[PDB]
Write a protein that binds this ligand. Sequence first.
Ligand SMILES: Nc1nc2c(ncn2[C@@H]2O[C@H](COP(=O)(O)OP(=O)(O)OP(=O)(O)O)[C@@H](O)[C@H]2O)c(=O)[nH]1
Ligand SMILES: [Mg+2]
Length: 172
Amino acid sequence: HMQAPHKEHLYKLLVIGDLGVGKTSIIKRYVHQNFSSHYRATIGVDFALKVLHWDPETVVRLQLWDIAGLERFGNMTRVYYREAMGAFIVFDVTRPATFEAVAKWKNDLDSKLSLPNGKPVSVVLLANKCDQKMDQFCKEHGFVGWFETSAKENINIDEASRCLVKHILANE
Ligand SMILES: Nc1nc2c(ncn2[C@@H]2O[C@H](COP(=O)(O)OP(=O)(O)OP(=O)(O)O)[C@@H](O)[C@H]2O)c(=O)[nH]1
Ligand SMILES: [Mg+2]
């Protein structure tokens, strides 16, 4: 006797934000349980896979697209965004200018990507490096929620991803 296979959801998720805010470190902590203090800049886009045992009958596979910080100044984001179901937009709490870039990334995303029915994709805001007004910002810029995160100390990355996936499931 075999047990029945689990239902599966496969989601391509974007991780965007300006240089050095911690996008790659968030993904590396989430998927590989690892962190590095050395800064190695992403070139173009890198990828990582997260398998989530969502509930006893369900598996969620996340294809994470780790986009480099300078790409909002290029012309590749529309290609990079294609077929994504959700995104994290990231800034660095220690460098407030990176918060000002959050709206630029959000407008870039919303102008180049929408769900098949025309609804904008689910987006969660990550205030990263928290180891070192937000509600109003999320309501005014169309975010489903926000979290203080730390790739170094592993704070709220699991929680923020679960929040994003919950919203994606609810809007399919
Ligand atoms: N203290 C602290 N440092 C962090 C955290 N996350 C990332 N860093 C550091 O911030 C620097 C930049 O991290 P990256 O993950 O490479 O940032 P990025 O957004 O991927 O940068 P680009 O790929 O160039 O756009 C690295 O030195 C990391 O060690 C964090 O949560 N806390
Ligand atoms: Mg990177």
